[PDB]
Design a binder for this molecule. Sequence first.
Ligand SMILES: CCCCCCCCCCCCCC(=O)SCCNC(=O)CCNC(=O)[C@H](O)C(C)(C)COP(=O)(O)OP(=O)(O)OC[C@H]1O[C@@H](n2cnc3c(N)ncnc32)[C@H](O)[C@@H]1OP(=O)(O)O
Ligand SMILES: CCCCCCCCCCCCCC(=O)O
Lengths: 339, 337
Amino acid sequence: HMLFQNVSIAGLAHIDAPHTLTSKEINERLQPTYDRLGIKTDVLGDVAGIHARRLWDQDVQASDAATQAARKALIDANIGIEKIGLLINTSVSRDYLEPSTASIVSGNLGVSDHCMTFDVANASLAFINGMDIAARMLERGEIDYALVVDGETANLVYEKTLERMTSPDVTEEEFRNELAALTLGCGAAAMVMARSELVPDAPRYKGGVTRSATEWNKLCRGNLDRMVTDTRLLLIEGIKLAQKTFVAAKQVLGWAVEELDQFVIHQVSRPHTAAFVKSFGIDPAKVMTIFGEHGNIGPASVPIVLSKLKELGRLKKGDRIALLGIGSGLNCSMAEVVW
Amino acid sequence: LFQNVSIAGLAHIDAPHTLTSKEINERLQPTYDRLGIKTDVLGDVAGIHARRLWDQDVQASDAATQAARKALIDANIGIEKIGLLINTSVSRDYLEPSTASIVSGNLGVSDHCMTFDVANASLAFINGMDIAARMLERGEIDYALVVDGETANLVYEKTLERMTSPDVTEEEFRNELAALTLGCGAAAMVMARSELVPDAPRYKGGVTRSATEWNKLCRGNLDRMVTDTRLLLIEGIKLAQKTFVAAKQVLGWAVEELDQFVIHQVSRPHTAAFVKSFGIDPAKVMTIFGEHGNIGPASVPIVLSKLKELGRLKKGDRIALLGIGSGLNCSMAEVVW
Ligand SMILES: CCCCCCCCCCCCCC(=O)SCCNC(=O)CCNC(=O)[C@H](O)C(C)(C)COP(=O)(O)OP(=O)(O)OC[C@H]1O[C@@H](n2cnc3c(N)ncnc32)[C@H](O)[C@@H]1OP(=O)(O)O
Ligand SMILES: CCCCCCCCCCCCCC(=O)O
């Protein structure tokens, strides 16, 4: 069913950004605005369910964060950069409109003049898009190894959003529109993929399915210093698209929820995740969450969670792992890894 | 090499307003005299006499959508046949969502349609073609759209502001001069499985080489681009030369056996230096930078579209696509008409 054959995960790593910014600290700054607007509940901690997120230093570029994750992934795969035939950067954050962030990461790492490099961008689903693009090359044997890399920077969005929200003249509409920006987090991930013949004991990536609802492309719009979001509609329409995607997953992947061992789900908030889980009858014990302390790390979130599961010893040979995400667009992808 | 991939349709959009270099020079003149500049670098050296700008508030997605509708017409298919849409432009108005999702919503793609952006300076359209080719070959989709709209209005407005500020120095001038060689435009291409379109040109793919140590040489956002023009020409030509040598082995290329060269459009001296390297007949190399400037990753398919519309290509004609982009990355591929 066009599922990938002989494509494996040779190496995986994540980077947690070092600086903790608490929702309590945020609420401190926003309190005069809350009081003016008559907001009496903690919409960050109690409603969204986010208690903290991580930020980098101000001088860290997306390419820097991605470079860090990539070096750690190369070590996990026990290979040198000279073996990499393809490097794709999947992040929402970017250094410049041009050149690609991939070219910057590739120069930092010292790839060879045979290495193919470029960025893919697609909100929170891009890492999975990157894995599929690499998989198609690896399956046909065009390359032996690929790197998929992703660094996210939320520093500037916090800095400018907080300034706008605490201005004496901010409107209730603008405040509500920008609030979800304060659920984002910094972080990075990278994966080394390989032809299975080279790594017979490595986990296998099978791919999976994708569905879209691009008529909803206005729901969440972001730039370096601003994100505007219709949270209510994003939930309702996101969930509808996921159910459609699940029907497809059952068809091509043969999925039955009680037969899956882990669900690695992109997270936009605690209620969004709860609605998702309840929708498909998923065992909550099978769903790791880092949103509470890391917020939403965009397209890095899924591979960060998978890396964290690996490091926690939660994954064992033969485990069936579902990668699931809804991304601004809207887009929804569901794929399988067999550990 | 790709065996079962074809180009079902192709289209370009020329932007409607002309900004001549003569007119730029009139604005720049007091800066020129204050700095003792006696040369017309744009006109006499770069050989860019004009470029096109959009009406105000045309966004990248708008330009790309215009081109896509035209390319669907050229392919004789409705949007419901498209299983994949990739946007490859440098211009974008948001980091999220993809500019592809916005174009896709404009066009009304189906809920089965996979969409996303590829970014790779001026090489991204060829990258997007190759990504679509692999999906077509593998049987995942029947038809793909690759789209690209570029918006240079802002970069011109802000760059001309800076170059006329009374403080401006000659080094600042030289550092931003390359931004005055850019232009607006758009292109889109429909790719398909060959069994569906037997008379259509075949896309064979090609080879890719990189020189990623040179990533600092040209850096740009919507309002500003800085460029080391001298080193970029020298290193860009080195990499183009290496990739062309590689193309000679794996594609079997010999210069006298290719009918058209479709080159990324950078400047007269860039172009001249490449074709002299390999003794390429300049008559086999269509150029539009003279009046359109550098339209980034859309430059190559805009040229290909213009050749198609000129209507003088014939079946069996071997067409070399020579793409390159700030990075540096280079890719060369073959279409057989
Ligand atoms: C970023 C997003 C924006 C929005 C989207 C946009 C579109 C899509 C995106 C596209 C993405 C874009 C991505 C990209 O990558 S675009 C980057 C590649 N493009 C360019 O570099 C632009 C064109 N550059 C050239 O054509 C050549 O380098 C020039 C013509 C400059 C020199 O060529 P050449 O080597 O043959 O000339 P020469 O050395 O013998 O000098 C002769 C004369 O010229 C004078 N001179 C030389 N250099 C400069 C200078 N820098 N400033 C001022 N003057 C200069 C010099 O003083 C001398 O004068 P005179 O003494 O004899 O008095
Ligand atoms: C294969 C193209 C041959 C033309 C020679 C161009 C010289 C290299 C300069 C490349 C500059 C980057 C171009 C871009 O991203 O717009």
